[PDB]
């Protein structure tokens, strides 16, 4: 919408100035130069406008192959619920889950699969007592 | 209402333990959004059609002065320039007098006409081509500026004539690092050069258009220099052929629109997608 305001407004200026006195002999020339502009505004334009279609396609993609890792780590998360249920000391946020899951990045879906749970193990396990520390590794593993 | 009886099939449980008036408050929605995108479409294709008219109408009757005329600027009254002295048509200098009238002797000696300084048409081309020939003649007897006008192809000659009506030849000749690359035919390191110089800092608009002309040897950025370049907006009435796409889907479009807003307050993330890829199908 930036763009197309842009267009809109040198669109104006164009229209605005084309009828302005009669002649334009040698201004509106001068105007031209910034319709002149106006083309290549208008380029930039079909250049977002191309890279659109191409966008859309690869992105719808790029959430089908990270699918997997959503759904691993909704029921790795839900086993850390479940260890809160337990006893007052084991609760998990969501907002925790996903500020571990931050650490694995700061066959590559695969890599980053191995590290949520090698990651998610790495942290949690200091909250929870030698019990719940085997109970996890056995659980996730 | 196959979505209504779909919503509440796939989501709602128990034997009609609720009411519709999803389908109502989805009803209402579309009629606002069918509405408004109808309306903004509409003023839009009243706009481009409008302003096609206006280019129909533009098109009336039917080179280097377009060139010149572009970034100095054509006057058919005396007027002046950015030192304040006398000039008319296309940078052509009459008198550096402060004198009024110094201005309408010597024109009128010119183009052999009693004129107060109001010129026709073809007497601007006519004074314009004169001073150019003359421009030429010159930079051929400076011995710094030759060896390159001679190089040069008509074009980048047309823009090293456009240096000259600027800076005056004694100016351009300064240039001799972005000359000598002009010569030995490398064009882009001559423009990186002719982008540094105090030329451009003051005038960075048209440096940079005989830059681009120097570099590609082409009309473009400024033979297209016809007004003929404006007839070819014309060809971006290809929105008209857009909107019949945009307009066509705009029903379904407002469909999904009301029934997001209205069934789907309430719905999980995943239920959202698999009721859109219901109401898609």
Redesign the interface.
Known sequence: TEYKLKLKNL?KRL?EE??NSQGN??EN??L??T??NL?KE?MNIEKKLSESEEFFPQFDNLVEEYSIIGKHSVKIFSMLEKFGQFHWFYGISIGQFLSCFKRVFITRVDEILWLLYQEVYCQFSTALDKKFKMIMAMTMF | IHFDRNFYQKMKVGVNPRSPGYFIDGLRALVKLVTAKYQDLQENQRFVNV?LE?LNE?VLKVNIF?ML??DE????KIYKDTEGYYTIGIGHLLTKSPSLNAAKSELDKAIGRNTNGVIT?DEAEKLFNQDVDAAVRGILRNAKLKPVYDSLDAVRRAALINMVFQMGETGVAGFTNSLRMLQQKRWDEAAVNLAKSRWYNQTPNRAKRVITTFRTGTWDAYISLV?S??F??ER?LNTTKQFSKTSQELIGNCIISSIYETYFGHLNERERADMLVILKR
């Open positions: 669109e229209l084309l009828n002999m040698l020339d001068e031209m130069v319709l002149n083309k208008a | 302003g206006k533009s377009e005329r572009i600027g054509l006057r058919l048409k007004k370049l404006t070819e907006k971006w």
